[PDB]
């Protein structure tokens, strides 16, 4: 997000937006015909009234919501991962159920999920996207921003951010020189890697100390450790 570049039409068909209260608050990713994956940290106190949540499909430009290229949708059921604490910021993954089935088109496509024993080795570029603030002070009301960050080992992640246990349930991506981050404004963005020419889902954006801060990257939750929970009701 921070320091990113403008995306192209249909570049990220699997990224969807979530609207509550009339403004975008958190991002989500399309997996199945009627399910989405989003960070559980943002959708914590707003899960009791799914009717007020509006699901936006293919929100390439935030200025067009009623455009024919954008398919509005409503949220029916919100499911939060039980093993969430809000204290360690662990297992910040949530699943949302769409009221109606969503068709797949050129600009609306699903995303892959990690399989068993599928761990991305560190040092690989992985793409990120979101509609969050790109300057850490202003606001984002323009085209979707995209960026690519490399995967960093958790051993260095714990040292560079001596505030959380991190453990093996989190994956950290960023640049030691700083300037690129996606943990501001829109924390629902997905962490996307490239395994073969089919693409994959790696993680979901989570808490970040500060954007563009030197040697202070973001935190992502490994979807590979939540694949079973997602598939338990993916249908």
């Amino acid at each position: 997000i921070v320091g990113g570049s403008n995306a192209k039409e249909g570049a990220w068909p699997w990224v969807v937006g979530l609207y509550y209260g009339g403004r975008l608050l958190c991002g989500a990713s399309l997996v199945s015909s009627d399910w989405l994956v989003s960070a559980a940290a943002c959708v914590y106190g707003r899960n009791l009234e799914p009717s007020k949540w509006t699901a936006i499909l293919g929100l390439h430009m935030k200025s067009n919501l009623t455009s024919p290229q954008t398919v509005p949708r409503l949220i029916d059921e919100i499911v939060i991962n039980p093993h969430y604490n809000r204290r360690r910021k662990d297992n910040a993954i949530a699943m949302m159920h769409l009221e109606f089935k969503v068709n797949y088109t050129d600009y609306i496509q699903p995303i892959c999920l990690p399989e068993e024993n599928q761990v991305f080795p560190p040092g690989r570029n992985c793409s990120i996207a979101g509609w969050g603030t790109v300057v850490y002070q202003g606001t984002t009301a323009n085209i979707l921003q995209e960026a690519d960050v490399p995967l960093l080992s958790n051993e260095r992640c714990q040292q560079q951010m001596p505030e959380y246990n991190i453990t093996e349930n989190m994956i950290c991506a960023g640049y030691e020189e700083g300037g690129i981050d996606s943990c501001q404004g829109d924390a629902g963005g997905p962490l996307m890697c490239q395994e073969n020419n089919r693409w994959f889902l790696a993680g979901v954006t989570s808490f970040g100390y500060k954007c563009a801060l030197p040697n202070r990257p973001g935190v992502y939750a490994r979807v590979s450790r939540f694949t079973e929970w997602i598939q338990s009701f993916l249908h």
Partner: protein
């Protein structure tokens, strides 16, 4: 040179800042005789930025049921967290916030933890609740006389387990009777159908590509890839799968088949992150 200001210019009297929020704690872990308890000042209000832990204890083998007689809290800023284990791992189960009535919460073990999160503004009256415990309050008793229980507890003799259509109002028979058994990965496995409770293959008397694709679709995967049997090892009540004019599959059990074999299918993956952006290719 300005001088002569021999007067107490800062006439304003400073006041201590409203710092040190800390927490009040309130009631702690209590047994069954303790049922009704206010948070800290439930009839009036609650302090801002206060964190409290309430633990409900029950005898081994029992569960805990909540009943909030009055629930009037602030907006989404303030939430209430519910935990069961609080030993090595805990589950949220249910999170309640906002004014209005809330549904009951049933613990999954013999312990329940209630947590309060408060902001610095918009303090409301609070909330209160009591518990009575019991044996499987949230778990209905399964029906005897050969009845199958669904996810939500509804029990039926046999109107489910991959019939022509689900004869259940709840309709929680998401799991199918066809699964990959004795396979090598998620997409590779042997075809095993289950009429009622017995797993069996579908033979290869008239196996075609259309039925293979239909089976792959029923397994939540893509098209049929590498459809070829190797050798038979099962000895159960094998059924016959044949092509049908409609989109459904028909399984006819028969143990008098000839040249029986176990069919191994490698169904392709479903739709994935395939970009369809139309951009010019740079000739470099």
């Amino acid at each position: 040179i300005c001088n002569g200001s021999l007067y107490p210019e800062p006439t304003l009297v400073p006041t201590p800042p409203p710092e040190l929020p800390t927490d009040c704690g309130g009631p702690f872990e209590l047994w069954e005789p303790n049922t009704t308890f206010s948070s800290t000042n439930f009839p009036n209000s609650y302090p801002n930025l206060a964190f409290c832990v309430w633990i409900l204890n029950a005898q081994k083998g029992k569960n805990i049921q909540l009943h909030f007689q009055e629930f009037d809290l602030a907006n989404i800023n303030d939430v209430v967290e519910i935990r069961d284990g609080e030993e090595a791992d805990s589950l949220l189960l249910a999170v309640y916030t906002g004014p209005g009535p809330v549904k009951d919460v049933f613990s999954t073990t013999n312990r329940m933890t209630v947590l309060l999160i408060t902001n610095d503004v918009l303090a409301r009256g609070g909330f209160k609740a009591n518990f009575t415990t019991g044996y499987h309050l949230g778990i209905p008793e399964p029906c005897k006389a050969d009845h199958f229980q669904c996810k939500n507890g509804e029990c039926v003799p046999l109107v489910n387990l991959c019939d022509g259509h689900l004869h259940c109002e709840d309709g929680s028979d998401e799991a199918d009777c066809v699964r990959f058994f004795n396979g090598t990965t998620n997409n590779n496995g042997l075809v095993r159908f289950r009429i009622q409770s017995i797993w069996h293959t579908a033979c290869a008397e008239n196996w075609t590509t259309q039925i293979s694709n239909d089976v792959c679709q029923l397994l939540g995967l893509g098209s049929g890839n590498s459809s070829k049997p190797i050798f038979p090892t099962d000895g159960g009540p094998f059924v016959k799968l044949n092509t049908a004019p409609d989109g459904h599959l028909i399984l006819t059990p028969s143990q008098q088949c000839l040249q029986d074999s176990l069919i191994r299918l490698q169904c392709n993956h479903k739709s994935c992150g395939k970009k369809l952006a139309a951009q010019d290719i740079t000739p470099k």
